Design a binder for these strands. Structure first.
Ligand SMILES: [Mg+2]
Lengths: 48, 18, 586, 72, 1186, 49, 45
DNA sequence: TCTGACGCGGC
DNA sequence: GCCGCGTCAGA
């Protein structure tokens, strides 16, 4: 072999590193949907 | 002489020491 | 990012060869501009303007015209064009290559209990290849809610994991492949089933397609994922679809090595045996009898049969009566499906007939009937090939008796030829050729002798001594096409004979000994020549056939059956291809 | 090969290729209909084989199957 | 028959007929002696000058530029290795020896030769030169602490070679092959022109050189064909060929030509080209000492060319061993030394052009670098220096006798074919024509034949017995490879009659190199032995002469990948050669002097030597054992002592056999009562069935010693730390960690626990809004550090045995570092102090016992013992304060050592010595195997269908002999299960041993205690030795079988284990030694779901080292095409490998559980469109409406 | 996302010169070595008739 | 370099091109699709 | 090594 | 219009 096939991609999100995210990106998007009537939702969205 | 020789170093040395 | 400079271990970096050629053309252009500015003499202007052209050509593809540049390590650099050509290049390396995911590979073992559409699978590789499916089923099952949850619960191998895994793969076929993949039977689809251990098991009847044997070969395994794919594997790629070979209609799953030994063994006959000439109504009768241990399995009995038989023209006529069979063959009566005539099983059953059975079954009865039949054939041949305890001693190799004198005649004639030469009465080359023929013919004779010396055994049976076909081991291993041929028998019991020096010109001294008797140093040395030559000749071919099939695949890669009829009315004239001595193809 | 095989299905539909595409369409339809209510897929087989069984028993008459794509 | 210590423990009944003319020479001579010639001298061999000094001789008088500067060589002195062998390995260094020489410089007024250099510079000193890597006693080098071996090299000889590439007639040629430089030639044509070329050129007529000197016709056939006129036209024409487009000069080409063939440092033949040319031409009238070419020589060349063109001569054979020679390491290193000296002296002629000093000393001049930076490179990167394949003691010897034809100055893997890959009739006594590789290398490796040797010029000789008028004498000579062409040689089995006269008349022999029958009147030599033809690893195959060759090839190539196991078990059917290999490799401990055992324990041995019968000695010597030392393939090495307290031993006996040996017999496997019967398919093709008694009794179980190592660097964000302090980690996963960040010594680590815990800092979070929120809910702080610890990779287990830790440099170490290092060097120094103290206690016991003169005799030996104790306690601190130069940039590093037993399991690979092999297919419970009538069961169930087709019969005969030995074992057992007396045991032992065979072991020579050791050691079986071509014949095996009480067959009656009803057709049984091969299944499983990807192409990795990804290569694409399997081919090329969106998309679809696919386009194609676009070519997608 | 480099004096694409047959040669209807001489600064050639 | 001059167009139309670019090759089930889906038009039209 | 397709120069 | 001698392209 050669060295030019042991260097690997390090600055991206392996398809697991980018699947444990939408499982959270969508989680709280529902968690909040069982909170305030509407207000604190608006406030947390605007302020975060 | 101008005899198809490709490498430039000779084609420069020739004229150089003229 | 197509010529990176990523830093790697050792606090060092890994440039690409393109970075250097770029870093050269650039500062050469820069110096050129500076010169043109400063109004230098035209000689050095010329030298710069030429050095620039050289670096540009090197960047495009160095080595086209000069003595292509090298780095410190003194390798010819990998220029631009040198990336999209050659076997290691870009086209046939990463566009038709693609190391894929969801794959694994390990050592193969036999597993003679499976069915023709199954395969063992170590639970570890299974847990790995199916992991996301397991994740999905755990989440939906309500035993974990996040992904970190399931990943943390599979890392420790919970018990429910194994159950959910087993239900994942209930009907999820996989692929199996062996490295040199010459024909489409080099890839087939099976249905896994969990096993412990760390090696793949595959049904033996297919080790002829994959051209595999169990001395260490390793197979790969890929998974299909979609709904179209893992249905295409089921319909077009499962082992139960590939019976006949695409090359020629001959079947490909016929019993091979000692599945044939047992069948041929229990399907022979013997003259004076126990229970001879008895009477039996049906198969179960013969079974009950034979398990009681009174009858010899090679005995001749009379069985009354009654079963349908399929005619050529789609008829199905009834057949009945009493037939003189052998205790062995009746034991195979159970497996024959209703539809085939008993006339197939009622013979001695060497390989060329087992294949006949399978072909006949396929062409009239269906496809599934054939795989079930081959199932039972294996299941039985394995059984009766070990109750017979076939084995091989050294006295099973019987040297013929007339060997010494048959050698004496030959060596005396040789002395006579040397006489005719020594007094210059005969030339040289003719002496050589006639010596060759002498040794050849005598070796042929001494070889043909051991055939009668090992395939026949006389015995003073009740009344007298009559010759009968022997039950010798090494004779049965080769009269049944199981594994062997006449030549090996010759070199075991007869004599080696003529050993060709590298070219092929025979040596004027033949080897008189044989393997049961061993050889002297010189006699072994004379053989190692051809040994090494023939051994080396394969390795120096393994790349050539692949070359030719590659060329051929290119020539016709785009021939597809696209339309029912082309309507034309022109073709060729065929006729039996005589060769002045025989038809050789009707 | 649990119960049903291609040799069965090949009697109604033909060319053994049309089988693939037709069964795939049918299994996709049966899949997207929310059949995955999860109290059944652990007692029976995947839809990929349910479709084959359905085509073998000659229940669907694939001439009909396509008419479920216009139902998309 | 004991005659020695080890054999006295378990004698080996022997067979054969032939008397033992000459013992086999030392095995590793080729590798050792090729170094003494380069480093030392002996006048007896005539070697007055060590080749090193000879290479030094040819450079030093240089006298740079008239500056009254003289440069003369005086002497040379070799330093001492700062660290001995066993230490330059542990420290991670190179066993080295510094080189220093002596130079004198002299000067005077240095005017226009007015007493130029006569008066000044009366001094001289021993300048440092460089470093010289020394070899151990066994022929290996430790380079950066890694035992390496430099295989010899076979290469064409320097001289004249005439051939004819006969796609023509008379297309003769010639070559003057030089030892270093450029090689001429002289070819013919169809018509008869004598052309000439210089290694490659325009084809200019050969008379050009003759002008460059200035029925015999062809001169006139050529002279009138070239237009050249006179002397200088020749040179001005040649100079065009050598340098085209180079305008010639006047006083330039005159240097070119006469430097092309006529400069003693530009072209040479080195005592061989000269001799091989002189003898080829007879002309002694040319000095056989000057190696440069000569005009008389070249006209001889052309004369011989035309002479052969007439028909008076003979072309040569390029493969005939007299034309190819061996060149070992002691020559390669000399060559590199020569290059380095070139460089340094060329630099010397310029380091005088910067005079600034008063009374310049002759030391500032000399440089050193280009010498070591060349030697070291050849040693650390050359193709002819690979790791010593350290599977087992046979692997070592094989690798040290190997002889390649590859490397600098040789062939290439695809630049040869069908010729250099064959056994020439001259190979006979020199290279084994059975032992080679089997890949694309077959025919270029050629292990060495046993009795072979190397003459002073590098040709391989061989021994022989002369004959004198039909009576075979007992003189022995070493006949060369060429003189052998002429004589006629018999073979070692043709019998004699009480006076060494050939009983037969017409025999077989090799007359003209090839084989022929002839008459005893015309023979001149008989071979020294029988195994003279085969290698030193072929001779380990009983009944070799009853086997094929393609099969014995594999049988030899395989038994050197065999893996040693826990308890070595001697073979029961050997060839009396395992006594030799192991003894002839430094894995055993041979006593130097004869004496008595003082005190032995499993760490060292002490021997007091009776000086009465030994030369002047020291009354006590030691041997230090080596426990559990690793080896390149991760296999455990440990020696185990044999002797007992107070035993009489002799010089040349086995004190403690070590690696994979047993009582001094190379043993690689075990013995298994084995049947031959197809069982139930479970040995279908070549598979194997085992019996679960083998496993439960630790029969095939090895010890593999892994070794990990973690390192800590100084990165641009700060120092990384190995302290046992990392958040997100409990004290449970940390529980097995000590108070310093390093695991204990004893903790049975698991598959994925921490070995050393590290951390590295990071930055640049700017975390997602959701990460921000969730930090803001649980008050989750964002740590700036990340841990990268060291954990055992999955699928492994084991425990810990050693923890090496190397600290930093130039920094006063802290408490747990400095104090711990002092405590470790203390546990070394104080313990070794008690060691040397026990040694001194032994010496003092032997002195006070001998007090009845120690007043002056050994009043200084302890003075030398304390000297070395101090040398080691200082070398235990004479390191760099951190044990290495640390390769700057590295703070701290640690080595971890893990060991794990492994047992055989379905999937491993066994293979007997006879070329048969297979994969273990199952393991059956004890009660299932077939079992003999007595009750004993059978271990293995091989398959009978194999043997006939692939004619490896010898395995059968091995099983018969094995059955016999096993019967003879049970006999002695029966006689010994009652009446443990001694006399009648001598009787039954006479019965067992002296019944068959003509050797008569002479069992009278043992006492009533040694007999009770022997009968005990013989219970398992009785060893037998069947030499390789002097074997034991059938009827002997049969008489032995009868003595044992078995059929005059191998065959016997067996019973199934599932019923009990017997099998018909009595089955063969026997013993059949078996091995396990280094192709385990634990390191070939390798599945993969998703992992890293390739940087430049975004595709998975490969190799199971990182995470693999199985190559779905090109040929597997045609398969899926032919099936018409479109879909499964499509997403096999995008979603699985290099569709960035599709990867995550599908991995998401799965975990959710819906149906969808997006397959836009792969990435490699975009990369291709770029790479083609980076040229003036515009490839691009488009649309079409026409 | 590519870039580019500015060349002071033009430079011949090697491919269309040394590809056998030379498209430059076939175009200008001259033998190659005669072209390479011009290119290697070894002669001149009338551009203005 | 030869096709570069002629501005060569290349209709895919083959088996070793739809693979370089990831498309259902025009054989096997590929033509089965191009048939069955085409038979949908005549209905929905 | 080769085997040739394809040359493009001496005559 | 051709008998020998080159380069290139795959082994
Ligand atoms: Mg194999």
């Amino acid at each position: 072999s050669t060295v030019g096939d042991f260097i690997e991609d390090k600055n991206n999100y392996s398809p697991i590193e980018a699947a444990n995210l939408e499982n959270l990106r969508e989680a709280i998007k529902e968690l909040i949907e069982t909170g305030l009537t509407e207000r604190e939702a608006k406030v947390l969205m605007m302020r975060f | 002489l101008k005899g198809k020789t490709s490498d430039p170093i000779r084609m420069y040395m020739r004229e150089m020491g003229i | 990012d197509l010529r990176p400079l990523v830093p790697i271990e050792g606090g060092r970096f890994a440039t690409s060869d393109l970075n250097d050629l770029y870093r050269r053309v650039i500062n050469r252009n820069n110096r050129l501009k500076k010169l043109l500015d400063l109004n230098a003499p035209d000689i050095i202007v010329r030298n710069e303007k030429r050095m620039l052209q050289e670096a540009v050509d090197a960047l495009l593809d160095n080595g086209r015209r000069g003595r292509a540049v090298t780095g410190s390590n003194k390798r010819p650099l990998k220029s631009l064009a040198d990336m999209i050509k050659g076997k290691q290049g870009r086209f046939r390396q990463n566009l038709l290559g693609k190391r894929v995911d969801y794959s694994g590979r390990s050592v193969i073992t036999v597993g003679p209990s499976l069915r023709l559409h199954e395969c063992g699978l170590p639970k570890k590789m299974a847990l790995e290849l199916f992991k996301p499916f397991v994740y999905s089923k755990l989440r939906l099952g309500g035993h974990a809610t996040t992904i970190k949850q399931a990943k943390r619960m599979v890392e420790l191998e919970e018990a429910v994991v194994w159950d959910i895994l087993e239900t994942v793969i209930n009907e999820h076929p996989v692929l199996l492949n062996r490295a040199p993949t010459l024909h489409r039977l080099g890839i087939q689809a099976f249905e896994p089933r969990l096993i412990e251990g760390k090696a793949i098991q595959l049904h033996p009847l297919v080790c002829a397609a994959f051209n595999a044997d169990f001395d260490g070969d390793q197979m790969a395994v890929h998974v299909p994922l979609t709904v179209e794919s893992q249905l295409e594997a089921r319909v077009l790629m499962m082992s139960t679809n590939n019976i006949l070979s695409p090359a020629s209609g001959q079947p490909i799953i016929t019993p091979t090595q000692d599945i044939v030994l047992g069948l041929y063994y229990i399907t022979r006959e013997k003259e004076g045996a126990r229970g001879e000439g008895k009477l039996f109504s049906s198969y179960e009768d013969v079974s009950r009898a034979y398990n009681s241990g009174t009858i010899d399995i090679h005995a001749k009995i009379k069985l009354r049969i009654d079963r349908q038989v399929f005619d050529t023209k789609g008829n199905t006529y009834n057949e009945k009566g009493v037939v003189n069979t052998t205790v062995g063959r009746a034991l195979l009566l159970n497996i024959l499906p209703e539809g085939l005539s008993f006339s197939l099983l009622n013979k001695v059953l060497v390989k060329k007939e087992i294949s006949k059975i399978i072909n006949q079954a396929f062409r009239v009865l269906g496809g599934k009937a054939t795989v079930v039949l081959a199932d039972k054939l294996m299941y039985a041949g394995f059984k009766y090939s070990t109750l017979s305890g076939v084995s091989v001693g050294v006295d099973d190799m019987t040297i013929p008796d007339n060997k010494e004198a048959k050698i004496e005649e030959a060596e005396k004639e040789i002395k006579q030829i040397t006489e005719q030469y020594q007094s210059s009465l005969i030339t040289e080359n003719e002496r050589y050729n006639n010596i060759i023929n002498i040794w050849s013919k005598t070796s042929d004779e001494v070889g043909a002798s051991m055939m009668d010396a090992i395939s026949k055994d006389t015995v003073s049976i009740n009344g007298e001594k009559k010759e009968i076909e022997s039950f010798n081991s090494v004779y049965m291993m080769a009269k049944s096409g199981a594994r062997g041929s006449y030549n090996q028998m010759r070199q075991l019991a007869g004599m080696r004979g003529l050993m060709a020096k590298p070219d092929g010109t025979m040596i004027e001294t033949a080897i008189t000994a044989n393997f049961r008797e061993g050889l002297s140093v010189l006699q072994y040395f004379t053989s190692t020549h051809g040994a090494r030559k023939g051994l080396a000749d394969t390795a120096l071919k393994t790349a050539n056939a692949g070359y030719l099939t590659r060329r051929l695949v290119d020539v016709a890669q785009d021939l597809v059956v696209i339309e029912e009829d082309c309507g034309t009315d022109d073709g060729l004239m065929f006729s039996a291809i005589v060769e002045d001595g025989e038809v050789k193809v009707p | 090969m649990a119960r049903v095989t291609v040799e069965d299905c090949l009697d109604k539909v033909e060319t053994r290729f049309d089988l693939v595409v037709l069964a795939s369409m049918r299994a996709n339809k049966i899949l997207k209909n929310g059949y995955s209510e999860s109290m059944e897929n652990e007692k029976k087989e995947k839809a990929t084989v349910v479709a084959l069984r359905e085509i073998a028993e000659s229940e669907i008459t694939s001439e009909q199957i396509l008419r479920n794509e216009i139902e998309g | 028959m004991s005659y020695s210590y080890a054999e006295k423990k378990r004698i080996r009944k022997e067979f054969g007929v032939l008397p033992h003319i000459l013992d086999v020479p030392y095995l590793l001579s080729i590798q050792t002696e090729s170094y003494k010639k380069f480093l030392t001298v002996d006048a007896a061999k005539g070697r007055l000058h060590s080749g090193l000094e000879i290479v030094l001789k040819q450079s030093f008088p240089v006298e740079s530029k008239n500056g009254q500067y003289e440069l003369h060589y005086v002497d040379y002195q070799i330093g001492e290795p700062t660290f001995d062998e066993t230490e330059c390995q542990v420290r991670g260094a190179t066993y080295d020896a510094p080189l220093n020489v002596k130079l004198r410089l002299v000067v005077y007024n240095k005017d226009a030769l007015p007493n130029e250099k006569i008066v000044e510079d009366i001094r001289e000193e021993y300048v440092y030169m460089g470093d010289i890597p020394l070899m151990t006693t066994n022929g290996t080098f430790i380079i950066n602490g890694t035992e390496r071996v430099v295989v010899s090299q076979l290469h064409r000889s320097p001289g004249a070679f005439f051939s004819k590439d006969d796609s023509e007639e008379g297309a003769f040629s010639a070559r003057i092959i030089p030892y270093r430089g450029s090689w001429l030639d002289f070819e013919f044509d169809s018509k008869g022109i004598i052309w000439a070329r210089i290694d490659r050129k325009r084809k200019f007529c050969a008379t050009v050189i003759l002008k460059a000197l200035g029925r015999g016709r062809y001169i006139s056939d050529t002279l009138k064909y070239d237009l050249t006129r006179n002397t200088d036209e020749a040179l001005v024409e040649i100079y065009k060929v050598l340098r085209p487009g180079d305008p010639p000069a006047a006083a330039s080409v005159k240097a070119l030509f006469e430097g092309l063939f006529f400069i003693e440092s530009r072209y040479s033949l080195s005592d061989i080209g000269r001799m091989k040319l002189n003898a080829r031409l007879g002309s002694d009238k040319v000095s056989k000492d000057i190696y440069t070419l000569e005009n008389s020589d070249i006209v001889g060349v052309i004369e011989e060319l035309i002479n052969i063109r007439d028909g008076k001569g003979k072309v040569d054979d390029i493969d005939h061993l007299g034309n190819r020679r061996v060149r070992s390491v002691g020559e390669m290193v000399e060559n590199q030394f020569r290059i380095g000296l070139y460089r340094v002296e060329k630099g010397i002629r310029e380091s005088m052009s910067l005079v600034h000093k008063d009374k310049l000393m002759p030391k500032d001049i000399v440089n050193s670098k280009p010498i070591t930076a060349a030697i070291k490179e050849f040693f650390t990167s050359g193709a002819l220096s690979q790791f010593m394949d350290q599977d087992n003691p046979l692997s070592e010897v094989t690798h040290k006798r190997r002889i390649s034809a590859l490397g600098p100055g040789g062939l290439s893997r695809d630049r040869a074919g069908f010729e250099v890959r064959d056994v020439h009739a001259t190979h006979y006594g020199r290279l084994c024509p059975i032992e080679t590789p089997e890949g694309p290398n077959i025919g270029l490796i050629n292990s060495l034949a046993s009795y072979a040797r190397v003459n002073d010029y590098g040709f391989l000789e061989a021994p022989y017995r002369k004959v004198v008028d039909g009576k075979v004498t007992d003189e022995i000579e070493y006949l060369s490879a060429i003189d052998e062409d002429n004589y006629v040689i018999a073979q070692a089995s043709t019998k004699l009659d009480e006076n060494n006269h050939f009983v037969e008349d017409i025999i077989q022999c090799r007359s003209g190199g090839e084989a022929i029958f002839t008459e005893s009147s015309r023979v001149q030599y008989m071979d020294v032995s029988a195994k003279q033809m085969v290698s030193a690893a072929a001779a380990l195959i009983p009944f070799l002469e009853h086997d094929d060759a393609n099969r014995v090839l594999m049988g030899a190539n395989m038994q050197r990948q065999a893996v040693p196991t826990l308890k070595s078990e001697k073979p029961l059917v050997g060839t009396g050669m395992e006594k030799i290999v192991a003894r002839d490799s430094g894995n055993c401990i041979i006593a130097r002097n004869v004496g008595e055992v003082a005190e032995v324990d499993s760490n060292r041995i002490v021997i007091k030597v009776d000086t009465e019968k030994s030369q002047t000695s020291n009354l006590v010597d030691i041997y230090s054992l080596t426990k559990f030392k690793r080896s390149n393939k991760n296999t455990c090495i440990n020696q185990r002592p044999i002797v007992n307290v107070g035993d009489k031993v002799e010089a040349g006996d086995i004190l403690a056999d070590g690696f994979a040996t047993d009582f001094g017999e190379l043993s690689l496997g075990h013995n298994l009562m084995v049947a031959f019967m197809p069982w139930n398919g479970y040995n279908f093709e070549d598979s194997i069935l085992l019996s679960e008694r083998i496993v439960k009794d630790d029969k095939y179980t090895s010890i593999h010693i892994e070794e990990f190592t973690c390192v800590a660097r100084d990165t641009k964000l700060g120092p990384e730390e190995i302290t046992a302090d990392i958040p997100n980690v409990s004290e449970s996963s940390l529980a097995k960690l000590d108070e310093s960040g390093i695991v204990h010594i004893g903790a049975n680590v698991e598959a994925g626990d921490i070995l050393v815990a590290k951390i590295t800092p990071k930055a640049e979070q700017q975390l997602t809004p959701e990460e921000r929120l969730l930090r803001a809910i649980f008050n989750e702080k964002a740590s700036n550090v990340v841990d990268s610890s060291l954990r055992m990779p999955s699928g492994t287990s084991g425990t810990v045995i050693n923890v090496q830790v190397f600290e930093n440099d130039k920094g006063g170490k802290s408490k747990r570092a400095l104090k711990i290092e002092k405590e470790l060097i203390d546990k070394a120094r104080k313990d070794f102090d008690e060691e040397f103290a026990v040694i001194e206690s032994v010496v003092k016991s032997s002195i006070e016992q001998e007090v009845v003169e120690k007043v002056q005799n050994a009043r200084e030996y302890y003075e030398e013992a304390k000297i070395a104790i101090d040398a080691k306690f200082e070398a235990k601190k004479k390191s760099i304060t951190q044990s290495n130069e640390l390769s700057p940039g590295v703070l701290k590093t640690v080595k971890v050592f893990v060991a794990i037993k492994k047992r055989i399991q379905p999937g491993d690979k066994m293979a007997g010595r006879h070329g048969n092999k297979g994969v273990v297919s199952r393991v059956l419970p004890v009660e299932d195997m077939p079992y003999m009538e007595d009750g004993t069961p059978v271990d293995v169930c091989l398959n009978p269908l194999g043997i006939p087709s692939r004619m490896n019969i010898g395995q059968i005969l091995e099983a018969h002999l094995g059955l016999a030995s096993y019967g003879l074992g049970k006999k002695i057992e029966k006689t010994l299960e009652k009446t443990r007396k001694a006399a009648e045991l001598r009787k039954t032992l006479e019965e067992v041993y002296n019944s068959v065979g003509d050797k008569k072991v002479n069992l009278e020579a043992l006492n009533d205690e040694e007999i009770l050791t022997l009968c005990d050691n013989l219970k398992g079986g009785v060893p037998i030795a069947t030499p390789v071509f002097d074997g034991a014949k059938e009827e002997d095996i049969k008489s032995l079988l009868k003595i044992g009480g078995f059929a005059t067959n191998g065959q016997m009656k067996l019973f199934d284990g599932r019923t009990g009803k017997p099998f018909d057709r009595h089955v063969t049984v026997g013993y059949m030694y078996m091995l396990k091969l280094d192709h385990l299944v634990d390191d070939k499983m390798h599945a993969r779901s998703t992992g890293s990807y390739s940087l430049v192409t975004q595709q998975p990795l490969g190799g199971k080292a990182q995470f693999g990804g199985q190559r779905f290569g090109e040929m597997e694409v045609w398969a899926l095409q032919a099936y018409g399997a479109a879909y499964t081919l499509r997403e096999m090329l995008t979603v699985k490998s290099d569709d960035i969106a599709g990867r995550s998309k599908m991995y998401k679809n799965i975990v959710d559980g819906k149906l969808t696919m997006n397959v836009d386009v792969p990435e490699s194609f975009n990369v291709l469109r770029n790479e083609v676009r980076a040229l003036g070519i515009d490839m691009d997608f488009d649309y079409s409406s026409e | 996302r590519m870039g580019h480099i500015d060349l002071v004096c033009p430079v011949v694409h090697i491919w269309y010169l040394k590809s056998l047959p030379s498209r430059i040669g076939l175009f200008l209807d001259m033998p190659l070595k005669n072209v390479e001489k011009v290119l290697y600064f070894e002669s001149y050639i009338v551009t203005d008739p | 370099t030869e096709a570069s001059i002629n501005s060569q167009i290349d209709n895919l139309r083959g088996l070793k091109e739809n693979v370089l670019i990831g498309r259902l090759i025009p054989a096997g089930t590929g033509l089965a699709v191009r048939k069955e889906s085409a038979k949908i038009e005549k209905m929905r039209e």
